Amino acid sequence: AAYYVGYLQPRTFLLKYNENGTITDAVDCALDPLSETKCT
Amino acid sequence: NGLTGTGVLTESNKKFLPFQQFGRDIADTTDAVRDPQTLEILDITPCS
Numbered sequence: 001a002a003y004y005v006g007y008l009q010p011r012t013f014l015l016k017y018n019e020n021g022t023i024t025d026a027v028d029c030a031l032d033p034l035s036e037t038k039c040t
Numbered sequence: 041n042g043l044t045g046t047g048v049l050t051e052s053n054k055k056f057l058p059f060q061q062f063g064r065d066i067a068d069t070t071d072a073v074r075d076p077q078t079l080e081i082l083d084i085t086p087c088s
């Protein structure tokens with residue numbers, strides 16, 4: 001066995017939905033400047 | 041169940057998740073709804 005621990009912080013996120021409803025892609029606003037371009 | 045509206049009601053091919061109960065378009069309208077008694081999926085459209 002093994003485990004992974006991560007922490008959450010306040011962020012804005014962009015979400016894409018599939019043909020039929022299920023989340024297939026995400027974009028994080030604060031990752032890098034290209035992502036800021038994509039979000040704006 | 042507290043969601044009140046008026047219009048034409050038909051069936052739909054969408055399949056809500058068990059926790060999913062309503063659907064919202066960009067106009068924040070109610071597009072589709074799951075019936076409490078038959079758990080089916082229904083499409084809503086306006087008339088005027």
Ligand SMILES: *[C@@H]1O[C@H](CO)[C@@H](O)[C@H](O)[C@H]1NC(C)=O
Pocket residue numbers: 018019020
């Ligand atoms: C829509 O649902 C079908 C199975 O019911 C699935 O095969 C399909 O992947 C979904 N549409 C897309 C674009 O993935």
